[PDB]
């Protein structure tokens, strides 16, 4: 027998629970943990094919694809409004969220070890067969609504609409045509195979996913409940719920569910999030001025002038100037040589 | 809470946006984020086999091989012109770019989840057989318009060259051939299977690729966007695009789309790259003379007549006089310099 | 001049399969913005 010690001063965590916790404002950056989930979006056909796409075709052809929503998982979003960190200020170092850790996960395996209600039979005397046939687990969350870049190949493909697919087909669309740039601002809109990050246009989202080819791929899961993911970086900063409104993203192709005739349809599933949060300081740059200017713009119309900047030029001129030069030899200097022989 | 907490004395972006930025004035470290990307070169049959190759042969022979371009990816390359730090620069310290981070990524798969559209019905009431196979995603980044090194089997082949293959067709061309040394200095021309690093020379390029042989071989990604790879080393360097022009280099075989006919043909896809650049300062490393020789003589004529030059010499002797000294009693010596000291040899 | 020369892809100007440069140097006491703004043609439209 030996002696007993401590407990500690505890950053309170009276606050507790689900969605309720949002409700207020609290003592400095205290910090909080959040349990939610967002469900799947397979573009599904059913409520039996809940967490599943519709069974699939094998072929069609380039020229000939146009599905319907039902085999078309689109991203699972929800935009999550968090209460403030920001409300009667002007200026100063203001606060955005930097939410510190999350574990979130595509949730729901154990039942799919059933192949004895059938699945599709493996063969032999052998029972059903699982689900599997490539899988993607991915998510990205960002404090921004997500700039996508749609990618098709086969721009002689077709598909519907709210199945917001990469928009504007070209040969180039097959290796993306500049367009197809989108914004995640609709729970399940962008069928996942159609949209791709306009990623470096999404700094303030962090994505990770692996799409996991082969052609049946045995999956593996790891419920070692301890990985912690910190929502930071090299500076130790994550995405910012700048807008304390959150664009949450994932795709988690659980695999292909082998509907009984080898009809396969995806199983994709719901995601969970357990979100460890903190109140973070930035520096207002949002002040009055910006409003003022804001103001004027509404206050205006929008006249159809004529266009002379960017791609519409008839303005010919951007140069900086600069304070009293001495007397260089010349002021025209090639800062990239242009080799063509050289 | 919200709060005027000391809000990080973060760096200073000044502007960003593409190409326009280059033109800029000077600001020491200076450093930059390149969000580029390259489209693939597959032998790209067309606008649909735009980013994909032509299909391929199946049981053959060296002998039974003439290539033609379409199936032939060659590596994708570029001179990216890079700013000149040195336009004015006149100091005895020299600035150069030294190359700091890339997080690049082969980009935009998502259509390729078609088990549909001609994806050879594997069977069942399940789907197709889409793409896949081996994949090689690779890139090399050079500072240089690099040393390639050609690799051929099959010098019973009948190869193209727009898809500039290596030349030379010894047995030894089938193993190393020290002559199939080349140099990538060409968009879609080194067909990939044909060419290999002359890595003995590749020292001022960094490449990373992992060629991933195998029948269908799965693509397992990662889509992080949250940790670069850094282009430094012991001496903190990557390629040296000494070249303020950029040698860009790549191959990204996604695998092969398998048509319903098993028309299999490589599929390649574009890579995005995200580069971090700084200004590194050096010494002089090379002298005036070595330079001078140029201007001068270059904006000039040649003089050579009866032959002297070389060795064809109505030239006569090259020796060393010099000094005035007592009397070595061999003085019609043969006076040398072993090189480091004086060799003094004769027959007398 | 002395250099050898090549063909590749056009990564600049119009013909750029590059996308972007993001100028750094200096510092600053961390604003709010996780981007840049300037004109109300940046910010506005």
Numbering used by the authors:
A (entry chain 3): 15 to 356
B (entry chain 2): 15 to 362
C (entry chain 6): 312 to 356
Article, verbatim:
BK polyomavirus is the causative agent of several diseases in transplant patients and the immunosuppressed. The crystal structures of these viruses revealed that polyomavirus capsids consist of 360 copies of the major capsid protein VP1 (Liddington et al., 1991). These VP1 molecules form 72 pentameric structures, or pentons, that form the basic building block (or capsomere) of the capsid. Each penton consists of a ring of five β-barrel-containing VP1 monomers (Nilsson et al., 2005). Together these form a T = 7d lattice, with an invading arm comprised of the C termini of each VP1 undergoing exchange with neighboring pentons to stabilize the capsid shell.
Images of unstained, frozen-hydrated virions and VLPs were recorded using an electron microscope with a direct electron-detecting camera, allowing us to determine the solution structures of the virion to 7.6 Å and VLP to 9.1 Å. Each penton contains five copies of the major structural protein VP1, and there are six distinct conformations of VP1 in the shell. A homology model of the BK VP1 asymmetric unit was generated based on SV40 using the SWISS-MODEL server and flexibly fitted into the corresponding density of the virion map. At the resolution presented, the gross fold of BK VP1 is extremely similar to previous structures of the non-human polyomavirus, SV40, which shares 81.7% sequence identity in the major structural protein. Strong density is observed inside the virion, as two ∼24-Å thick radial shells separated by a gap of ∼28 Å. Interestingly, the density associated with the N termini of chains 3 and 6 appear to be a weaker feature within the virion map. We propose that these densities correspond to some portion of the 13–15 N-terminal residues of VP1, which are not resolved in previous polyomavirus structures.
